[PDB]
Amino acid sequence: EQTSFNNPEPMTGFEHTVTFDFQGTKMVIPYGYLARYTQDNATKWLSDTPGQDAYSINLIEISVYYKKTDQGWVLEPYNQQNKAHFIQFLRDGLDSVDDIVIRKDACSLSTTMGERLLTYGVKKMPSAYPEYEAYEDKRHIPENPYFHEFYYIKKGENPAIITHRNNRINQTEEDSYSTSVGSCINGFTVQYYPFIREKQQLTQQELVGYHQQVEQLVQSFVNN
């Protein structure tokens, strides 16, 4: 199948969609979520190619700008208001834009991850969400006094594990948190490092809030 880059730069992110075929599953993505697939200083954007069915692929990476509001963090495609952040991200990666990796694949998250955390001495914590179980590990380790990890596990039909962790190793450094999310959403595995430019510790509400938008977004692509 032939590739083309014949869509102009977005103002809303919703001007065009690109249609993908994942082993027979149709995904229809608003092109503003596809910042990685542009040419000429992001003036040419990936497009559907007439004559061809749909890009037949195994995986796609969407990109979202994350923004503080008074109702919380929201995720946005490329638009005229946030464009400078995406352009900085495309230039060197140093802006508040995250990559979400979507693959059509069997879910490989076990239902026994929580058991394994507890088996290793991670502590079970009360959770702000009924659908999540929450875990924390802040053991004193002699050669790393800054160790701190959180885990949030969603089960049911669309499981997820969220790991938020302090990366600081030296006394001379500031605390530096980072997050990984592995999940399964309606036949896709969806893996990402959210809040990529955030060094500060995040609450369960900020993490789960982010992921809830990721699910809704991914489900919007297949729903049509």
Numbering used by the authors: 44 to 267
The study reports:
FrpD is a highly conserved lipoprotein located in the outer membrane of all meningococcal strains, and it does not exhibit similarity to known protein sequences from other organisms. Intriguingly, the FrpC1-414 fragment exhibits a very high affinity (KD ~ 0.2 nM) for FrpD, the other protein expressed from the iron-regulated frpDC operon. FrpD displays a compact, slightly concave bean-shaped structure and consists of fourteen β strands (β1–β14), one 310 helix (η1), two short α helices (α1, α2), and one long C-terminal helix α3. Hence, the similarity of FrpD fold topology to other proteins was not sufficient for establishment of structural homology, indicating that FrpD possesses a novel fold.
